[PDB]
Structures are given as structure tokens and as C-alpha cells.
Amino acid sequence: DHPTFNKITPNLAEFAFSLYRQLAHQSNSTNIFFSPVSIATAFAMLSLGTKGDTHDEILEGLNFNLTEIPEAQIHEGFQELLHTLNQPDSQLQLTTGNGLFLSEGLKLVDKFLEDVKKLYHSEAFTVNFGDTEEAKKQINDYVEKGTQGKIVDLVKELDRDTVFALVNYIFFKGKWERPFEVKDTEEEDFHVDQVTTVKVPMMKRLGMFNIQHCKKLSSWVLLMKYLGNATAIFFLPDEGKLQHLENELTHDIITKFLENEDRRSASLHLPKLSITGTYDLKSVLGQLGITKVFSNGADLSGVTEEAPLKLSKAVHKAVLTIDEKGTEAAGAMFLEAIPMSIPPEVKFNKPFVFLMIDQNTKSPLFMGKVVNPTQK
Ligand SMILES: [Zn+2]
Ligand SMILES: [Zn+2]
Ligand SMILES: [Zn+2]
Ligand SMILES: [Zn+2]
Ligand SMILES: [Zn+2]
């Protein structure tokens, strides 16, 4: 009977897909990119300072069923996971932070201040929202320092009555276990749709890949490993099957693709790009059923005993960069031969979906859809 993160990873997966479809329904002409694990962890942390329905609503909102699993194990699970995710010091640049900002006019509960800081290794600051421009600068300064300037001016303006603000961000850049030759990267066409074309740098390599064409999903399924036990899963939907692919993704199916270990020879064309997702959590989580904590009825007596408090603003920003880089230090020479037959062509020159997974812990680090590679 030891604390484990094994129990919640399945639900994190379901949460990834729930949020994804919600966003995919709102618009289908825009890129989608977010971190399931980051968002879930922040709110799992927040819940510790809430009580009653407000509390039960947050967890249910993250796809948990309080009868299916004990409340105590949900919290321990996120604590373990965080200690595993919050320090994968291999050569996978993964910086992620949680920053809480509360008005100086509130008497805060110690216990809460200690959990966020010692257990969840997150930040809790007091600020004077009386001076909006000053408060704003403090929030942005924090995120800029944490991302090393990789993320600036996240907040544009604070509301007059802002009393509690949450900021979650994450940045990622990996190294392929098997690099692409920078030389082969050439400018090709990316077909946004029948009449829209975008010029983009296309990486490419002919080789053996863990690739398979799933008839259930009507799509090509490609897995590529990063150094640091992180696995990228790309999905290239057949003509007119983007929606079917989106509606059919479930955690059970992902678990299966990861069992395939057979390789195949293919010509792969993958765009070189950088995408970012920026979302107003109050707006998106509200649709998923998480509303109380953002309302006047909120029960945050775990944060401040008697004062009427509510989460005024919550933002999430995710940034990912993908290129041909792999094993640094010099060109570790690989071997490339000529096929006996013409291998299949798998070009990601049209809208596609991808998912990033920590092979170790099996948690969904990222999920997204690229409709336009230059809409970064
Ligand atoms: Zn609880
Ligand atoms: Zn710790
Ligand atoms: Zn202003
Ligand atoms: Zn379908
Ligand atoms: Zn080719």
C-alpha cells in the first residue's frame, strides 16, 4: 500500500479527449494545443482549498468518479505524478509552472499555502489588485522568468474586481531518438483545405518506423520516440475522415497502439513547426461542468476562512517546438539503405492530430490538432 500515480493516469486520458472534443466543436478552422496533465494538476491542487460541491465538482470535472475511487487516493496520485513529471531531467526540455495570485486584503489559510508550496512545488503570491497594471506586471514577470523569456506578456489586462488569479504554463522541446537530416528539409505545400495552401518546411526521411494504418480510425498511426522516454503519436486521417478520427479516440485505443512494436519502411514527411495554445480556463472548463469555483457561490474556505472568494481568472499557455534535432555532440552516423520495393508515402501536408505521452508514467503531456502550421 504505497502512493502511486497508476490509478489516475487512465482518467487523465479521458480528460484529454473530453476537453479536446469540446474545443474541436467550438471551431474547426483553428489550431488546438494544450497540456492535459498540466491543467489537471493545477486544478487538482486548487481543489485542496475548496469544500463541498465546489470540491466534488472540480474532480468530477477532471473525469473522476468519487465512488469509483476514494478521494484520498486521487490527491496522493497527483502528488506522486507531479514528483515524477516535475523533474524528468533527461535531455527533454520540459519547464512547467503553477502560480497563484491573491489579494493582500485576504487572511490566507496556512495549511493551503504549505501544500501548494511543499507538496505541489507551486508558487503562491499576494498582490495588490488595486493597481491593475502593477499586478499584471508581476504575473507576467513571473511567467517570463520561469520560461526564460520564452513566454512574454501573457496577461493583457486585469479586471477591476480581480481578486484571485491562476496561471498555468508549459514549454517543451525534444530531441528525436533518430534525427532527420537538416539537408532533406525542403519547402512544400500544406493543404489547409481544397483551396487554401500554406508553404512550410517539411522534414523527411525514408526508413523503418513504428507505423500502421488503422482501419478502425481510417488513419495512418505513427509513433516516434523522443530521448527521455517521451513518445509522440501522430494521426493522419484518410480523406474526409478527420471527424471520425476525432470521435473515436479513447484511452483504450492508445494503450493498444503502444503495444505494437513491429516496424515498417516508409517515406515520412513531417512539418517543422512551433505551435502554442492559449486558453481562458474559466470559459473552457465551464462547459465541461466546472463552474462553482468561478462563481459567487464558490466555497474556497480552504484558502480563506470567511471572506467570499472565487477564482477570478485562470489561464493556460502551452508551447511546443518540433524540428529535426536529435543526439547532440556531433553527427552520430546512422545507416540508410535502398528499399526492395517502393515504400508507402506518409505526408503530413494536411490537417492532422497528435498526442504526446510520457512512456514512463503514461500520462498525456500534450494533445493537439494542426490545421495551419503557420498559425503559431
Ligand atoms: Zn479532496
Ligand atoms: Zn516534493
Ligand atoms: Zn492597463
Ligand atoms: Zn465515426
Ligand atoms: Zn516521400
UniProtKB/Swiss-Prot annotation:
Single biological process term from Gene Ontology: blood coagulation
Alphabetically ordered keywords of this record: Acute phase, Blood coagulation, Endoplasmic reticulum, Extracellular matrix, Glycoprotein, Hemostasis, Phosphoprotein, Protease inhibitor, Secreted, Serine protease inhibitor, Signal
S-cysteinyl cysteine: residues bearing it: 214
Domain of life: Eukaryota
UniProt modified residues of type Phosphoserine: 341
Site ((Microbial infection) Cleavage): residue numbering on this chain: 310-313
Cellular localization per UniProt: Secreted; Endoplasmic reticulum
Tissue specificity as recorded in UniProt: Ubiquitous. Expressed in leukocytes and plasma.
Region named RCL: 326-350
GO molecular function: identical protein binding; protease binding; serine-type endopeptidase inhibitor activity
Glycosylation sites: 28, 65, 229
UniProt-reported outcome of changing residue 130 to R: In V and M-Nichinan
Location (main, coarse): secreted
Modification comment: N-glycosylated. Differential glycosylation produces a number of isoforms. N-linked glycan at Asn-65 is alternatively di-antennary, tri-antennary or tetra-antennary. The glycan at Asn-28 is di-antennary with trace amounts of tri-antennary. Glycan at Asn-229 is exclusively di-antennary. Structure of glycans at Asn-28 and Asn-229 is Hex5HexNAc4. The structure of the antennae is Neu5Ac(alpha1-6)Gal(beta1-4)GlcNAc attached to the core structure Man(alpha1-6)[Man(alpha1-3)]Man(beta1-4)GlcNAc(beta1-4)GlcNAc. Some antennae are fucosylated, which forms a Lewis-X determinant.
Stated consequence of mutating residue 138 to E: In L-Frankfurt
Gene3D superfamilies, A to Z: Alpha-1-antitrypsin, domain 1, Antithrombin, subunit I, domain 2, Serpins superfamily
Gene Ontology cellular-component terms listed: collagen-containing extracellular matrix; COPII-coated ER to Golgi transport vesicle; endoplasmic reticulum; endoplasmic reticulum lumen; endoplasmic reticulum-Golgi intermediate compartment membrane; extracellular exosome; extracellular region; extracellular space
UniProt cross-references to InterPro entries, sorted A to Z: Serpin_CS, Serpin_dom, Serpin_fam, Serpin_sf, Serpin_sf_1, Serpin_sf_2
Miscellaneous remark of the record: The aberrant form is found in the plasma of chronic smokers, and persists after smoking is ceased. It can still be found ten years after smoking has ceased.
Disease link: Alpha-1-antitrypsin deficiency: A disorder whose most common manifestation is emphysema, which becomes evident by the third to fourth decade. A less common manifestation of the deficiency is liver disease, which occurs in children and adults, and may result in cirrhosis and liver failure. Environmental factors, particularly cigarette smoking, greatly increase the risk of emphysema at an earlier age.
Domain comment as written in the entry: The reactive center loop (RCL) extends out from the body of the protein and directs binding to the target protease. The protease cleaves the serpin at the reactive site within the RCL, establishing a covalent linkage between the carboxyl group of the serpin reactive site and the serine hydroxyl of the protease. The resulting inactive serpin-protease complex is highly stable.
Subunit structure: Interacts with CELA2A. Interacts with ERGIC3 and LMAN1/ERGIC53. Interacts with PRSS1/trypsin. Interacts with PRSS1/Trypsin. The variants S and Z interact with CANX and PDIA3.
Name of the featured protein: Alpha-1-antitrypsin
Organism: Homo sapiens
Gene: SERPINA1
